[PDB]
Symmetry: C3
Subunit: 138 residues, 3 copies
């Protein structure tokens, strides 16, 4: 029923060559609308602070709620975030707006992918909506 969508650093700045022209507020609106259509309730949060992201992951773990996570640059760097996410009992779907495999080599490594249920990259902001649909059909 409840799905948490958590966005990490810089994703508040959305709005165009690499990440598209959709703003973060528009993304929240699109996600909330799609969730409603699927019979879910999406709670969307964004922070540039790793400690804040960790707290939101901890809350999802305590509530046994699924998470759709776009960790931004922390994807490639944060073991702390990986360890928080490893506590999740419900599914974790990693989303990247851009195709990280077509960019710098450092972006092709994720600490999160090995512990995620699955990963969607390169499908733009529709990746979040597709992640929701996965969760609704499961």
């Amino acid at each position: 029923l409840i799905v948490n969508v958590i966005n990490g650093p810089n994703l508040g700045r959305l709005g165009p060559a690499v990440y598209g022209g959709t703003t973060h507020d528009e993304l929240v609106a699109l996600i909330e609308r799609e969730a409603a259509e699927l019979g879910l309730k999406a709670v969307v949060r964004q922070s540039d602070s790793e400690a804040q992201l960790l707290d939101w992951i901890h809350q999802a773990a305590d509530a046994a709620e699924p998470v759709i996570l776009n960790a931004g640059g922390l994807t490639h760097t944060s073991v702390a975030l990986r360890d928080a996410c490893a506590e999740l009992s419900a599914p974790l779907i990693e989303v990247h707006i851009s195709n990280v495999h077509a960019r710098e080599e450092f972006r092709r490594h994720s600490y999160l992918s090995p512990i995620a249920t699955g990963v969607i990259v390169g499908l733009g902001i529709q990746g979040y909506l597709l992640a929701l649909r996965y969760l609704a059909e499961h």
Copy 2:
């Protein structure tokens, strides 16, 4: 006399397969009791925020107090934390509850170990108590 025990991200969540069933509050109690038995005063702090950890390390450097540090995932990732710890004039003992050498390869690298006095891993929460005893006998 005063020893600072600093715990990094996710260690507030303690309480069981990998890290044991002892909670962070219980750990603080056990450490305070052992410190008292050894004639020390332990000040135990935990944060998921790297900036907060840095501030506590800075304070220990200014006070010339020893530190027992379990940096959590930041062990493997944070040069900033290493540099703060390199300022410490009193001993630094790195502690890990789990045997990081028996886990993923990324956990086998520490930015802290080269600048620590010593390192204890895999002995559970008793590692903190053994670190205290080292400091008391030195």
Copy 3:
């Protein structure tokens, strides 16, 4: 006209073998004086918090202002900081007080250098003043 000088973790602690004996407050004074002589206004900020640094970079991007950045240990570790800096339309000059190429191997890699206009290392705190002079003559 306005130049932002942003200092990352531990740089508040300046004041001597590796980084010199000039304190952060003295550095701010020296930078402000040099900026005035060059007809610039320098805004100098320091934080141990990556989220705070990101916010200051975001502000510079929105204002189309140049940045002189000494990211401290985050130089070697933070993709999030690199991505924020990649948004800057005005020049980015990376400065390191110490000669990072004469130190540990991990310090010889920077996420920032590939997206910076240029990089000054090893010239002490004069590196900041030289960065200002570059910006004034450009």
